Write a sequence for this structure.
């Protein structure tokens, strides 16, 4: 299925706090559509965290 | 069959079924009757010998 | 074609063509949809101008459009050849509403009282008209069936269908038969040439069906 | 009442075909982008 | 090292072939939609 | 790194898009990432001086 | 292929049906001595007509070739033959009118 | 050896997934375009 992989990519790789969920962030869901593609890089979690961070930044600009 | 047996018949082309099928639209394709001079001509031109 | 592909044509916009006065460059292939939409637009404006003056029948745009197209085939050629300004009086004068009522209510009468010249189409009510079995007079009658029953095996269907073909081919002149074969050929006989060669091919396959084998006797 | 099966075969609307082709186009673009991203990811991760 | 180099070269080679084929399908479906919705010249 | 860079090794840095493998391979040595940008010769002289 | 056969019933009641064109798609508004009406005496026999240019707002050979006068259309087509030429064969008893017939 | 093994499963996974996308798009296109002539009723 898909639930276990998404739970991994949310609570082990990205390590979001529980108060942040799919319904709170549309960009996070549209990005998890991509993040589940690669099964590697699940040790350098800092890279995924920074990627989500800059994705939020680029999503929130007024330009 | 109409010519050989000398019986009239009108041939119709079905266009479409309209008003949920309440009416059938058929254009004037071909009509046979002793009125038709062609019909009488072909009846007379048969070679029954 | 108009009935089948109406939803696509119905969305075509004609405002730039009619509103603008001087001729604008238009693609050569785009004539089809534009011309059909213009014709049906003229049909719609033709109906709506004469409603100033038992069952009430509701007709949608496409149904009445194809009906009036079938009634007079001159609409398309007249519209394409002549401008709208001179087309409007012609369609206004030629829109005989009583003839339309007679055609849409034509029943119980065949052939219709009106000549083929003025009108090209009519309508039939399925409920009022019963269905016969005209085969019982043409090829399902007893005598022709008995005449054509002679065949190699019981599996062969009655041959009166082919018997009438053979009689028509052998008796009637070839000009009439070739005229029909160009007019009302069936789908399976589209590749075929004429009635006589159809009889030739059917006789050939009939001879092919039955084969001969010789055996010796002690 | 009818015994022979009616409404056998006629052409359907074109809008459904158009929208399904737009979805197919979007899926093709996504496939191209995804395969490019995956091969580039493999190059950067394992081919160094 | 040499295997990695050759693998890199050939994989980057196939990527652009995939791109060209998907763009060919892009153009074909675009032409199909064009010929369906509104017939063009020629 | 050990050999001069071929043009193919110099990959383009484009922002906005996720571009995650680059962020994963920042510690790497061989690939060199550039903006889709170049410094003009006058600006080259100004920066040098 | 033949799909149905029907018979005209002997019963009749006048329908008196009032047809109404349900204006689901109202048309564009009309924007700018009555002109003589255009005669409806031409029916096309081909498909090339629709490919022609749109009518300019406000060839006779083309009319002769594609379109056809309805007067020649409505009349009966099959014609007989006389005895002037040397006695005719089986297929020449009945012939099509050359004007009405078309390839 | 572990990294080369991982590379080989990733390559096999890429092949399988591109084949799956190809099959899905083929099936969707064939099903959608078959309705154009209304083969099904």
């Amino acid at each position: 299925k898909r639930d276990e992989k998404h739970r991994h990519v949310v609570n082990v790789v990205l390590e979001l706090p529980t108060e942040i969920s799919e319904a709170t962030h549309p960009v996070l869901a549209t990005m998890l559509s991509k993040y589940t593609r690669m099964s590697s890089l699940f040790n350098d979690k800092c890279a995924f965290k920074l990627d989500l961070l800059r994705m939020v930044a680029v999503s929130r600009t007024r330009r | 069959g109409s010519w050989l047996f000398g019986i009239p018949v009108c041939l119709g082309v079905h266009v479409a079924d309209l008003l949920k099928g309440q009416r059938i639209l058929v254009a004037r394709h071909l009509e046979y009757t002793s009125r038709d001079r062609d019909f009488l001509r072909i009846q007379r031109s048969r070679d029954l010998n | 074609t108009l009935r089948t592909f109406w939803p696509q044509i119905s969305q075509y916009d004609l405002r730039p063509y009619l509103t603008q006065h001087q001729s604008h460059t238009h693609p050569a292939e785009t004539h089809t949809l534009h011309n059909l939409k213009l014709f049906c637009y003229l049909v719609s404006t033709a109906w709506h101008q004469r409603i100033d003056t038992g069952t009430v029948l509701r007709l949608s745009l496409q149904e009445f459009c194809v009906l009036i197209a079938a009634l007079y085939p001159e609409y398309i050629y007249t519209v394409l050849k002549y401008p709208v300004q001179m087309s409007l009086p012609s369609l206004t004068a030629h829109l005989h509403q009583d003839v339309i009522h007679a055609v849409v209510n034509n029943t119980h009468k065949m052939p219709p009282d009106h000549l083929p010249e003025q009108v090209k189409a009519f309508c039939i009510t399925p409920t009022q008209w019963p269905a016969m079995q005209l085969n019982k007079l043409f090829w399902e009658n007893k005598l022709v069936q008995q005449l054509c029953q002679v065949g190699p095996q019981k599996s062969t269907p009655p041959l009166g269908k082919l018997w009438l073909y053979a009689m028509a081919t052998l008796v009637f002149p070839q000009d009439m038969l070739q005229c029909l074969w160009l007019e009302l050929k069936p789908q399976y006989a589209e590749t075929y040439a004429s009635v006589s060669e159809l009889v030739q091919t059917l006789f050939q396959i009939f001879t092919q069906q039955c084969e001969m084998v010789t055996e010796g006797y002690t | 009442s009818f015994a022979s099966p009616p409404i056998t075969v006629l052409t359907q609307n074109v809008l459904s075909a158009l929208e399904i082709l737009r979805l197919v186009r979007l899926d093709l673009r996504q496939l191209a982008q995804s395969v490019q991203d995956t091969i580039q990811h493999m190059r950067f991760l394992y081919l160094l | 090292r040499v295997r990695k180099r050759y693998l890199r070269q050939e994989l980057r080679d196939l990527g652009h072939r995939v791109q060209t084929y998907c763009e060919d399908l892009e153009g074909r479906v675009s032409e199909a939609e064009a010929l369906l919705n509104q017939q063009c010249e020629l | 790194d050990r050999q001069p860079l071929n043009p193919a090794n110099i990959e383009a840095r484009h922002h906005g898009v996720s571009d995650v493998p680059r962020l994963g391979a920042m510690d790497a040595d061989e690939p060199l990432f550039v903006d889709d940008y170049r410094a003009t010769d006058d600006e080259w002289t100004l920066q040098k001086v | 292929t033949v799909v149905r056969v029907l018979r005209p019933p002997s019963t009749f009641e006048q329908d008196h049906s009032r047809l109404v064109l349900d204006e689901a798609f109202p048309t564009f508004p009309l924007y700018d001595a009555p002109t003589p009406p255009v005669p409806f005496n031409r029916v096309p026999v081909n498909i090339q007509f629709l490919r022609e240019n749109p009518p300019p707002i406000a060839d006779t050979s083309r009319t002769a070739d594609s379109a056809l006068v309805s007067t020649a259309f409505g009349g009966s087509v099959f014609q007989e033959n006389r005895l002037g030429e040397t006695p005719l064969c089986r297929d020449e008893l009945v012939a099509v009118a050359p004007g009405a017939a078309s390839t």
User: Anything to note?
Assistant: The helical segments of chain H are 2-34. Residues 2-34 of chain H form the longest helix (33 residues). Chain H is about 80% helix and 0% strand.
